[PDB]
Design an enzyme around this catalytic site. Structure first.
Site, PDB file in Angstrom:
ATOM      1  CG  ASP A  99      45.922  37.590  39.752  1.00  0.00           C
ATOM      2  OD1 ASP A  99      46.662  37.866  40.661  1.00  0.00           O
ATOM      3  OD2 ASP A  99      44.759  38.192  39.526  1.00  0.00           O
ATOM      4  CG  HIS A 111      46.828  46.993  44.273  1.00  0.00           C
ATOM      5  ND1 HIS A 111      46.284  47.391  43.046  1.00  0.00           N
ATOM      6  CD2 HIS A 111      45.807  46.480  45.042  1.00  0.00           C
ATOM      7  CE1 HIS A 111      44.965  47.133  43.095  1.00  0.00           C
ATOM      8  NE2 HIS A 111      44.645  46.592  44.298  1.00  0.00           N
TER       9      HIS A 111
HETATM   10  N1  LIG Z   1      33.057  30.409  35.345  1.00  0.00           N
HETATM   11  C1  LIG Z   1      33.231  31.471  34.706  1.00  0.00           C
HETATM   12  N2  LIG Z   1      32.799  31.535  33.444  1.00  0.00           N
HETATM   13  C2  LIG Z   1      32.867  32.612  32.622  1.00  0.00           C
HETATM   14  N3  LIG Z   1      33.448  33.727  32.934  1.00  0.00           N
HETATM   15  C3  LIG Z   1      33.924  33.699  34.176  1.00  0.00           C
HETATM   16  C4  LIG Z   1      33.854  32.669  35.089  1.00  0.00           C
HETATM   17  N4  LIG Z   1      34.468  33.032  36.270  1.00  0.00           N
HETATM   18  C5  LIG Z   1      34.897  34.276  36.034  1.00  0.00           C
HETATM   19  N5  LIG Z   1      34.570  34.735  34.795  1.00  0.00           N
HETATM   20  C6  LIG Z   1      34.769  36.051  34.207  1.00  0.00           C
HETATM   21  O1  LIG Z   1      35.688  36.761  34.955  1.00  0.00           O
HETATM   22  C7  LIG Z   1      35.085  38.013  35.419  1.00  0.00           C
HETATM   23  C8  LIG Z   1      35.630  38.519  36.743  1.00  0.00           C
HETATM   24  O2  LIG Z   1      36.907  39.049  36.435  1.00  0.00           O
HETATM   25  P1  LIG Z   1      37.676  39.799  37.576  1.00  0.00           P
HETATM   26  O3  LIG Z   1      37.140  41.143  37.602  1.00  0.00           O
HETATM   27  O4  LIG Z   1      39.136  39.861  37.214  1.00  0.00           O
HETATM   28  O5  LIG Z   1      37.494  39.156  39.037  1.00  0.00           O
HETATM   29  P2  LIG Z   1      38.551  38.290  39.832  1.00  0.00           P
HETATM   30  O6  LIG Z   1      39.456  37.718  38.787  1.00  0.00           O
HETATM   31  O7  LIG Z   1      37.756  37.190  40.491  1.00  0.00           O
HETATM   32  N6  LIG Z   1      39.534  39.081  40.913  1.00  0.00           N
HETATM   33  P3  LIG Z   1      41.080  39.724  40.986  1.00  0.00           P
HETATM   34  O8  LIG Z   1      42.228  38.695  41.412  1.00  0.00           O
HETATM   35  O9  LIG Z   1      41.159  40.781  42.070  1.00  0.00           O
HETATM   36  O10 LIG Z   1      41.462  40.299  39.664  1.00  0.00           O
HETATM   37  C9  LIG Z   1      33.603  37.790  35.422  1.00  0.00           C
HETATM   38  O11 LIG Z   1      32.995  39.081  35.273  1.00  0.00           O
HETATM   39  C10 LIG Z   1      33.471  36.845  34.234  1.00  0.00           C
HETATM   40  O12 LIG Z   1      33.350  37.606  33.041  1.00  0.00           O
HETATM   41  C1  LIG Z   2      44.611  39.965  35.966  1.00  0.00           C
HETATM   42  C2  LIG Z   2      45.083  41.028  36.932  1.00  0.00           C
HETATM   43  O1  LIG Z   2      45.126  42.205  36.530  1.00  0.00           O
HETATM   44  N1  LIG Z   2      45.523  40.674  38.173  1.00  0.00           N
HETATM   45  C3  LIG Z   2      45.839  41.684  39.169  1.00  0.00           C
HETATM   46  C4  LIG Z   2      47.138  41.342  39.834  1.00  0.00           C
HETATM   47  O2  LIG Z   2      48.076  41.561  38.806  1.00  0.00           O
HETATM   48  C5  LIG Z   2      47.392  42.201  41.092  1.00  0.00           C
HETATM   49  O3  LIG Z   2      47.789  43.525  40.779  1.00  0.00           O
HETATM   50  C6  LIG Z   2      46.133  42.259  41.922  1.00  0.00           C
HETATM   51  C7  LIG Z   2      46.393  43.149  43.119  1.00  0.00           C
HETATM   52  O4  LIG Z   2      47.562  42.706  43.822  1.00  0.00           O
HETATM   53  O5  LIG Z   2      44.879  42.659  41.331  1.00  0.00           O
HETATM   54  C8  LIG Z   2      44.620  42.051  40.068  1.00  0.00           C
HETATM   55  O6  LIG Z   2      43.772  41.030  40.184  1.00  0.00           O
HETATM   56 MN   LIG Z   3      41.021  39.293  37.740  1.00  0.00          MN
END
Ligand SMILES: Nc1ncnc2c1ncn2[C@@H]1O[C@H](COP(=O)(O)OP(=O)(O)NP(=O)(O)O)[C@@H](O)[C@H]1O
Ligand SMILES: CC(=O)N[C@@H]1[C@@H](O)[C@@H](O)[C@@H](CO)O[C@@H]1O
Ligand SMILES: [Mn+2]
EC number: 2.7.1.157
Length: 448
Positions: A189, A49
């Site tokens: 990320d 964060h």
């Molecule tokens: N194989 C996949 N195919 C299609 N969409 C995907 C796939 N994997 C992830 N996604 C999309 O990405 C979304 C998750 O996004 P997100 O909330 O940012 O989780 P995260 O990226 O795993 N974690 P974070 O690092 O904390 O942001 C899912 O709800 C999907 O819409």
């Molecule tokens: C895509 C996106 O918003 N990525 C963020 C990253 O920027 C960072 O703040 C993280 C917590 O450390 O939570 C998220 O996944």
């Molecule tokens: Mn994410």
């Protein structure tokens, strides 16, 4: 850093995942892919964060990723498919890119990535192609599957277009374009995804975007453990709330220290402007901000603004009706957190006889901080992090955004199996629990 993403030339058949993908593309589109693309997810080792606050982080790419088989088409027709049934096919032929934050349907993440590239080069016409998506990163689990899709989609688009960009640039662009989804995150990320390098971890810096190898400790295994609590960042405001909260805190911090707050956007900016250190910045915060929560009127007051300007010129859509702002706590979190990161590293660069133990600490600290100050943990994450500890865990903490998701943990070599078992055993009783190494970054794959 002008190096671009690499281009692996492959003999499809030697890569089961690929050949499979190839086979289903054909079934789905009646043709074969012209090329492929991969972008790994990542594990944030520490420094949660703070990316959006302008502070440096230390993550590493995981091996799990998003793989897209691509076929360019002469039409203005974009057809997306996913090997996963949960993810419905999607098509469009619109130059006008319409991203819905109302229901971040998976495909929208692909559009963010594509859209960013098109715009980067001033293009309006939709880039026609057929794509079959295949990700192996556990979704909404703290591993940046969203960013993997984003970056992958971007790389694909650039390749199709046959234009060039550095890895940096790509990271930079995909960091901004992901926000199209509605999230106001930082750039860790995407940066790690494009900048990762196998066998090493990286200290990613911002403005300027920079990455620095970080050699991990010699005797511990990093182990990802999924709380099994799904957190979809785009589906929930928690994240943006925190983004606002800090932004507000920074403004008020500047005000106080008599700087130009109007321009201030991020917390680090304040530390910068003051020429002070992190520790000092903590004292400032302690002086500048009251613990008890801030309110919208009070805020306005402090800044010499109008609630309308707040709302208008400062707030986010999904934060407008917030009554309560925890400026003190978020800042306390941010500032310490950056400090840990810089530390963790430094240590890593020294290699003290009590390395792990140390680092371990730094890690527990992150967790508690996130937990108590940042309040982005969860009960499930909370237990998981204990249990982990309970079995060998030299370091355990949530990873990624929080509020569900995974936890990372430094288990020392020999406890692994027990950890693995006992944890498995406790929490649980490869998919939810498993070890990790510093994976490599995004790449283009050419069947050659
Ligand atoms: N194989 C996949 N195919 C299609 N969409 C995907 C796939 N994997 C992830 N996604 C999309 O990405 C979304 C998750 O996004 P997100 O909330 O940012 O989780 P995260 O990226 O795993 N974690 P974070 O690092 O904390 O942001 C899912 O709800 C999907 O819409
Ligand atoms: C895509 C996106 O918003 N990525 C963020 C990253 O920027 C960072 O703040 C993280 C917590 O450390 O939570 C998220 O996944
Ligand atoms: Mn994410």
């Amino acid at each position: 850093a002008t190096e671009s993403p690499a281009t692996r030339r492959v003999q499809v058949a030697e890569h089961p995942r690929l050949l499979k993908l190839k086979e289903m593309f054909n079934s789905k589109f009646g043709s074969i892919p012209k090329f492929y693309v991969r972008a790994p997810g990542r594990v944030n080792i520490i420094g949660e964060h703070i990316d959006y606050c302008g502070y440096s982080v230390l993550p590493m790419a995981v091996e799990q990723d998003v793989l897209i088989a691509v076929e360019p088409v002469k039409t203005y027709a974009l057809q997306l498919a996913n090997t996963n049934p949960l993810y419905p096919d999607f098509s469009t032929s619109a130059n006008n890119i319409q991203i819905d934050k109302t229901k971040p349907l998976w495909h929208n993440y692909f559009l963010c990535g594509l859209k960013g590239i098109q715009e980067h080069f001033g293009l309006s016409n939709l880039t026609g192609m057929n794509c079959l998506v295949d990700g192996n990163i556990p979704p909404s689990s703290g591993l940046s599957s969203s960013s993997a899709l984003v970056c992958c989609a971007g790389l694909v688009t650039l390749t199709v277009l046959g234009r060039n960009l550095s890895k940096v640039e790509l990271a930079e662009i995909c960091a901004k374009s992901e926000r199209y989804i509605g999230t106001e995150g930082g750039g860790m990320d995407q940066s790690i995804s494009f900048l990762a390098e196998e066998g090493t971890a990286k200290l990613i810096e911002f403005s300027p975007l920079r990455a620095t190898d970080v050699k991990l400790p010699s005797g511990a295994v990093f182990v990802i453990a999924n709380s099994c609590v799904e957190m979809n960042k785009a589906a929930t405001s928690h994240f943006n709330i925190r983004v606002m909260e800090c932004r507000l805190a920074a403004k008020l911090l500047a005000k106080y220290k008599s700087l130009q707050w109007d321009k201030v956007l991020r917390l680090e900016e304040v530390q910068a402007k003051l020429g002070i250190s992190l520790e000092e910045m903590l004292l400032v915060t302690e002086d500048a901000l009251h613990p008890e929560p801030y309110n919208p009127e009070e805020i306005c007051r402090c800044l010499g603004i109008s609630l309308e300007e707040l709302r208008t010129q400062i707030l986010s859509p999904n934060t407008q009706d917030v009554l309560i702002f925890k400026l003190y706590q978020r800042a306390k979190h941010v500032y310490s957190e950056a400090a840990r990161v810089l530390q963790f590293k430094k240590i890593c660069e020294e290699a003290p006889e009590n390395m792990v133990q140390l680092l371990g600490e730094l890690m527990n600290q992150s967790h508690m901080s996130c937990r108590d100050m940042y309040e982005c943990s969860c009960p499930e994450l909370d237990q998981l992090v204990d249990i982990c500890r309970k079995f060998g865990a030299q370091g355990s903490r949530l990873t990624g955004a929080g509020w569900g998701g995974c936890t990372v943990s430094m288990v020392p070599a020999d406890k692994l199996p027990s950890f693995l078992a006992n944890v498995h055993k406790a929490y649980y009783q490869k998919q939810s629990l498993f070890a990790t190494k510093p994976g490599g970054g995004a790449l283009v794959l050419l069947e050659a």
